[PDB]
Each structure stands twice: as structure tokens, then as C-alpha cells.
Write a protein that binds this ligand. Sequence first.
Ligand SMILES: [Mg+2]
Ligand SMILES: [Mg+2]
Ligand SMILES: [Mg+2]
Ligand SMILES: [Mg+2]
Lengths: 394, 396
Amino acid sequence: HMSDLPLRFPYGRPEFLGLSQDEVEASADHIARPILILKETRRLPWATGYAEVINAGKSTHNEDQASCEVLTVKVSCHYWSLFDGHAGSGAAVVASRLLQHHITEQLQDIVDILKIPHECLVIGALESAFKEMDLQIERERSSYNISGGCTALIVICLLGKLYVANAGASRAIIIRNGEIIPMSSEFTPETERQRLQYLAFMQPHLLGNEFTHLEFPRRVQRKELGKKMLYRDFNMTGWAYKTIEDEDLKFPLIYGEGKKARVMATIGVTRGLGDHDLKVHDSNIYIKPFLSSAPEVRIYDLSKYDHGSDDVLILATDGLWDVLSNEEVAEAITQFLPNCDPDDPHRYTLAAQDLVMRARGVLKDRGWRISNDRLGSGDDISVYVIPLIHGNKL
Amino acid sequence: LPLRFPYGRPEFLGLSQDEVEASADHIARPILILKETRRLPWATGYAEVINAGKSTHNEDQASCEVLTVGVSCHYWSLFDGHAGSGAAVVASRLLQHHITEQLQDIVDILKFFTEKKIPHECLVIGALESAFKEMDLQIERERSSYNISGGCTALIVICLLGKLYVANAGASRAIIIRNGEIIPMSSEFTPETERQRLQYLAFMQPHLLGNEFTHLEFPRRVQRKELGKKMLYRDFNMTGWAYKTIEDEDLKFPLIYGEGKKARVMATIGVTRGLGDHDLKVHDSNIYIKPFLSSAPEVRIYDLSKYDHGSDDVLILATDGLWDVLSNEEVAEAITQFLPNCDPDDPHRYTLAAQDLVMRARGVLKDRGWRISNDRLGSGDDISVYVIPLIHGNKL
Ligand SMILES: [Mg+2]
Ligand SMILES: [Mg+2]
Ligand SMILES: [Mg+2]
Ligand SMILES: [Mg+2]
């Protein structure tokens, strides 16, 4: 078992924060929830801004991880990464340190050719890298305690193009002159319903005869055996009527609405790394067959636009987007960034901090509150602000 | 062994048997049009032409009528048969009955402890999605008591309560020409567009490949002189390409082979959705193709109430015989230049627009095959075209 094995890496915060062990402990405060920002004395590539904050109490540690550095492919390749961990820190810490090496190795297989479109070769490298980061986690499970799982949002800049690769529910948007360019999509039971339902249909042994792949508008009761009810199948976007026939009384594979939706009443996110031994609650059904480490890759050509000082790429974990819409984030960046000197390298760290504070809020008597009395996010929050001007032509 | 229905042409053409026979001319290829004393719903235009030789009969079918649910529902349909004409004929006559029944199930609606609120449009989409399946299930049961060869793609449109519903299962296409704007109302289901679904299924159930097929895709045919050579591949979970050594199973014929619209599943079919094909197999093999096919359509909605449509705003439905030589832009160019030459209230204008489209795809025969503009090869497929004027879909 994994709890008999040593950790592969010690827990920490993003190393580019340059935190001492004492400074890490100050950050893990559930009452203060101190927003950590990147020191002015430690600059990230492209003067990238970073801010983070711990959850409001649900876990003792911040289970987000981040990694940022310039790789060199034997070509330089800028690398930003965000990982949202669950059921432990092991996956997110391992991924935050080893994924960029899988990316570097797969890119070396095609680096000559970069000097079949080339974009499809880069995408292919990222897709193999995610798969090989898994698998390595899978095989090293038997020598190290790589706990839990994590989602992964990464971006690389290779030869004038940004590649945004997502396997989870973090989000990347570009704010280019006030308009929002979405660079990622989320992977959830709602958004992946048909993939999961189809797999449950083609592989019914994965359901352990505790589950049905059909969806219903509500929990089917035994008193409705033989009546007519709306259902939805894997090859349907809409609903039609069916008679309930014993099988439909099994618990549904997908169940719930939005952020309460779940797969086998267990997971609320359907892609990422780790979770190799994760099981359904009170059951011996393995969840991993329904999860995928395959990212969705979206490309942005920085050559085709002349980016100004307030044109930024926002990477953030669901801790931000769960309380702030894309338009709120756009509004916030566009109002804050014109208030800092365009030549100040601390600019985008301050905007990142401003975003976190707008999502964390302030602790009142019945919880954390943001603007207009809304509830503030209780998750870990991590935010990159990447200024796109560092990607301009010449 | 007996035919479920007799072969024919669309009934709204009013053709005698001698006219049907006269139309099936591979050399002349006469463009049949909706006669001007025949009116379709919304004065819809229709025109068609037989292929340039690959089958004795026009394997396209089309069906256009007003369905009753208390509630009326305008219906347009196009079917592209292959490996026979029976599925297309059955579908042309029966799919609307299945659509009617599924809509009758939901027509009255149209007039912690979470409960999902289901929009009325989703009930309509569910009705169309179920109707497509039921039709294919009816073909599957009755194919042992009737000669219902072989298979067909299905594209249909219905207008129910001032919204258009376009359901596509095949490689026919629906676009809207509104002002000059092209509004795609459909997408194609081919080994190219559906590569990952097909690849994932072959991977999860490798017995469907028999033993003559690999589920991996390669940028060319992998040859014997390749073992251990290192070459690019694409798996079901990959949008891009990456390198791989090349082992011995990589030498089997690819599940997907070809490029663009010419790509094929198992060296047999070039479409992956439609009706029929239940006993369709790989040539000189007992590997069955139908596990990879799907009767499930995609459904797209256009809200007629949100735009005041002019006399030349039209919805174009055509089989691939048109789109395989004419782009969306050419069709848009042809429509926007032809229709201003006809009186807006002449009911025959949209039929003439459809004829102009069919003519621009078929071409003219000399000694160098069928030729359209700029000496291009014209389409030798069956071509069938609706031109549906959206002005007659305006509210109030
Ligand atoms: Mg987390
Ligand atoms: Mg989170
Ligand atoms: Mg045909
Ligand atoms: Mg055809």
C-alpha cells in the first residue's frame, strides 16, 4: 500500500515564491487567509504575475500547485503550469515538478522539424507528455506515496505561439483590449456526460451493477416502476419518454446540476492526473477508468496581433472562477492595470493579487464575503497574469 | 425478398412511371424540377439530377409535407442512399411518421432533492433523436421480411412553433443564406470528422477489427520496410501527432485511411452516420461495419422570430453531390446573384434557384467528362437541392 511508502517530494508552495519554511507556515492560516504574492526581488519569466491564497478551512494545506520556468529543448520554451489537487498533495506536487520534463522530452522528438503542420506536432507532444506524466505516477505508486489526484492547466510559448493545454476545471482566458478570448474549456460530468455514458454502455462491468448509464431529470423511485419518464442517453442531447424497467432504479452514473454534478456520486471533475486507486464511496468500483489524462490543446498566434501592456493571459484554478465570471475578471484587470506604471515589472503581480482578493473577500460573522454580499470562494485560489506583449513580433 | 415500397422519385414531383424512367439518363442527366403548378410548403424550390453512371437509379430521396401532431409541423427531408435504394425510399416515407409520434408524446407540454428543468426545445431535439433511432430499428426488424437495401444518410428539417430544427446524420449539408451571411446549420459525419469516436470504439472492443485492422492512424500507408523505423501516429485521445517505433500490428490496414472527404472506415464506407447498412460488411470479409455506424443525428436550431427575413434569405438543403464540387461560398454567390433576377413574388423563383445550383454542380458533357466553371470537373453524383425561403417563416 502507498501509505507504507515515503513521499516522492516534500510538500511545499511554488518554489518560485522563494518561501522559507517559516514563511510557508504563515501562509497556511485559515482565518487570515494571507494572499501570497511573488516577491518584487524574484521576477518570473515575462515578468509574469502570480498570487495565491489558501482555502477557508476544508483542508490543512493549500492543495494548489504552480510551476513556471523557461525550458530548453535540445530552443527555449516558456512554461506556466497550474495544478489543483484533491484527496492529497502527492499528485499535484509530483506533477508540478515532473510534467515539464515530459514536455521537454516529447518536444525534443520533433525539435529539428520545427527548424503535417508543426502546430499538430507540438499538440501531439503535449498530449503524449500528459499521458507520460500519468503512467509515471502510476508505475512509481509502488515506491512512493504519490497521494490523490490533480487537474492540470499548462501553457507553453514555442516559436511565437501559445499552447494552452487543459485537463480539468482550471481556466485560461486572454483579455486583449477588454475582450475575452477563451483559451480553455472545463472537463466536468456535465460537459463530458456523453463520453462517460457511452463508456458505461460499452463497458457495463465498470458499473458494478450499482449504476445505470441513463440520465433522468430526478432520482427514479420504485413507486414509478412501469410509468413514463423523461430520460437522456449517450447519443441524445435532448430528452424523450421511456418506461421505467427495474434497471432504471439503479443509481445514475451522472447526477446533479452544475458544481454539484458528480460521476458515480464521487468525482466532480473528469480529467486530470493521478487517482489510480480512487474508488466509489462504499464500493469496490474504480473511478480511474472514467477519468482521462488527455488534455485539450488550444493555440494562440502572438504574431497576429500587436499586444499592449494591459493585454494579458489569465490562468487560474476553479477557486477563482467559482465566484468570478469571465466578465468580472475582464472588468477587474482592465480597471486595475491602467493604475500602475506601464514600466513597472510588479504590475501583473499586483493585478493577480487584486483578482485573488476580489475572489477571496473578507471574513464576516457568517463567512467570507465579496462584493454585493456574495459569498467568497472557500477554495485554494492561484492566479497567473502573463503579459502578452512579451510575445510580440521581432 | 419483396420490396417494402416501390422505387421512385419524390412524390411532390408528380412523375408518371414513364417520366421517372426518362429521367434516369446517365448521358443527358436531365435536371428535374418541381413543376410550377405544383407548390411545396413555403413555395420551397426543389431540383435534382441523376448521377453520371455509378448506379442505375437516383439513390437520393426527398420527402416534403405538412405533418399534424392539433399542431402543424412543416417537414423537409433529404436522403442519400448507397449500396441500393431501398433504405432511402423506406426512410423517405416512414421517418416522418416516427417524428410525428415522438412529437405527440411531448406536444401538450409545448402548449438538495434537485429537479432538472428541461427547455421545450430539448424535448423537440429528443423527439428527433429518438425518431431517427426508431426508424433504424424498424429497418433492422423488417429487413428480414422485405428487400430493404442497403443504407442511407438522413438530413431533415421541421418547423414547429416558429423555430427551425435541422437534424443531420450523414454528409448532406444545411446552410442559411441570410443577406449575404452564411450560417451553417449542419456538420458532416465522416471518418475524418468522427475519427476519434471510431478509434476509441475499435480500441475498447478490438474484436470489431477482426484481425485485418489497426485502430491507429498514420500519415501514410505503413509498409513492411518500416519495423523499428520510428514514425508518426495518432491515437483516439490525440488531436496532434507524435512518434512511435512501428511494430508488427502497425502494418495492418488502418481503421481510418485517406485524407479529407476521401477518408474511409475499413476501406469500405466514407460516411459514419445514417440508417440501414445492418448487414454491411468489409469486402471479402465477414467483418461487420454497422457497429461503427450511428443513426444518432446532430440537431441545430434557428429561431425564425429573431430576424425579419427578405425574399432572398433562404435555407439550402443539398446532398453531397452538390457540396463536393461547390463550396458554401460559391453556393452563396450563386444564390445572391440569381435570385435578384426573379420577381420576389414569383413562386417559381426558388425552384429556379435550385435548378441553377444543380446546374452549377453538374456541368456540361463534351469529350472530357462533365465540366463546370473554370474547366473544373463537375460532380458525377446524384444531386438533390431544396431552396427554402425563410420569409414565409416570419412571425405575425
Ligand atoms: Mg483542490
Ligand atoms: Mg480548486
Ligand atoms: Mg448516394
Ligand atoms: Mg450522394
